[PDB]
């Protein structure tokens, strides 16, 4: 879809990531694994909750009998109720479709933004494979991996080390 | 062959299907169905107050005191009234009732 | 022998949901009647099988 990440450059999902909607996978000599990015996940959830709520709140708002001399009145009544019915059914079905579209794209965008964050952080200290993975030009241990994840990664620290390896 | 980090998204065994403008029958990891299709199939008391069952009496029949309708002679509070489409026991002595429908809209209040 | 806050000719509704397709004519406090056979919000994201 729109942001080109989900079913995008990142080709599939992770059945392996159970803690979140979006996250990381890493491998190094210390080990390998899936990690959810709990912030982005929860925030997206809050957004979706707001969305569906607002759909409920905005939507949240007897018969009669008539004689046989009352044919036009009766029909006027029917046409009215039926009219409002048609209008509300339309509004609902439509609102649901459109918001669905928006929702999927919202998720896509979230992924894209996460990826972007990591990329723009890591710079040329890594190779960017284009599958959603970055291969490091320097040794990245669990502290460094967490630093990437928690947004703190140190470029100048691994800079020239990465440089030499990227070159040779 | 160096150390590696990846970004990705959740997947599960979900069979859940939704439609969009661009696309129909899309599967999603999570969904909420907001339309309620089911009911208990019973006629019930409403806020702990029972409805008035007319049985085979018409509204008119009950208000007039049609003999068959004698079981409705005294009644408590009602949440709503239940009338058959064609009640047997209307006015026994035949005749008419003027402004009948208006009177029903009145009974509804 | 029953209790509801919402009533239709077909039966009674107890639900947390915004809409019902069950019947037009309803007494009590009730979800919005619609003509729809289904209304489903996507919340999670697309399920894309892996490799």
């Amino acid at each position, epitope marked *: 879809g729109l942001f080109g990440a989900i079913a995008g450059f990142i080709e599939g999902g992770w059945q392996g990531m159970v803690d979140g909607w979006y996250g990381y996978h890493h491998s190094n000599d210390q080990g390998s694994g899936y990690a959810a990015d*709990k*912030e982005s996940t*929860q925030k997206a959830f*809050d957004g979706i909750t707001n969305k569906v709520n607002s759909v409920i709140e905005k939507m949240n708002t007897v018969g009669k009998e008539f004689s046989n001399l009352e044919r036009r009145l009766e029909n006027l009544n029917k046409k009215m109720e039926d009219g409002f019915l048609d209008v509300w059914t339309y509004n609902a079905e439509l609102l649901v479709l459109m918001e669905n579209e928006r929702t999927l794209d919202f998720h896509d965008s979230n992924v894209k933004n996460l990826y972007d964050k990591v990329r723009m952080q890591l710079r040329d200290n890594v190779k960017e494979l284009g599958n959603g993975c970055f291969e490091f030009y320097h040794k990245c241990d669990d502290e460094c991996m967490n630093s990437v994840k*928690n947004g703190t990664y140190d470029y100048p620290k691994y800079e020239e080390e990465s440089k030499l390896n990227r070159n040779e | 062959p160096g150390d590696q980090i990846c970004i990705g998204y959740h997947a599960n065994n979900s069979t859940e299907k939704v439609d969009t403008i661009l696309e129909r029958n899309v599967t999603v990891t999570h969904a909420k169905d907001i339309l309620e299709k089911t009911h208990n199939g019973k006629l019930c008391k409403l806020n702990g107050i029972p409805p008035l069952e007319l049985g085979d009496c018409s509204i008119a029949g009950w208000l007039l005191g049609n003999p068959e309708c004698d079981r409705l002679l005294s009644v408590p509070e009602w949440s709503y009234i239940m009338e058959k489409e064609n009640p047997r026991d209307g006015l026994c002595y035949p005749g008419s009732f003027n402004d009948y429908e208006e009177l029903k809209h009145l009974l509804s209040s | 022998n029953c209790e509801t806050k919402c009533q239709t000719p077909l039966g009674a509704i107890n639900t947390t949901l915004p809409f019902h397709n069950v019947h037009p004519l309803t007494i009590g406090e009730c979800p919005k009647y619609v003509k729809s056979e289904k209304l489903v919000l996507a919340t999670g994201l697309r399920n894309v099988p892996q490799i």
Partner: antibody
Amino acid sequence: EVKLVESGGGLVQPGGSLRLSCGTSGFTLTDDYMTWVRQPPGKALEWLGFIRDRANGYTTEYSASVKGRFTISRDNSQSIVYLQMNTLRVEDSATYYCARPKGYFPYAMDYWGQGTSVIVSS
Amino acid sequence: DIQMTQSPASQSASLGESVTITCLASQTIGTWLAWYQQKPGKSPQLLIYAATSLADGVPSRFSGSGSGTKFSFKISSLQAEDFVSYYCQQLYSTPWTFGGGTRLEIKR
């Protein structure tokens, strides 16, 4: 909104039994990860266990303090999570909450019930 | 299983001041800590999740920090109604343990 309410607390002979009910109300997007947490008065909070949503298989986990005695189950019909406590002991005396995450993923317990207290003595 | 050590168990301070509770994990729970307030005679209320991340509709004066084992929780501008119990909880692995508790008392 959600508003969990719990019920059924009382006094029991040890060896005895009790069944606690936490009912759920309100529109929500998730039933999953319904947890029982108790607080003996003056003491800290202690986590008893949880039961999961239908879709997740109704699976259940327990603290090894109460494991094998207590059982968590849910009747969706009445929309309640029951904690069925058997072979009650003296240290089981505490106040009891059901608590819930709001999300799909259990990062924290967002929704609490109001508590109900059970005592155990001879 | 997993042990959560919260200190100080009791702390006194006065209005407007800044107070810091610590929580310590026997394992590394990564970033799966959460922080709760308990007003007296009430159920707990969620304050922080994912250790450093404010729950919806919470005052900005409440903060949280840390990773792995060491964790911190801070009330920046102290307030009248803030003097109550606080608990950490580890949601990293079952059983989801709690800290000992922290009682906040107002200086007099």
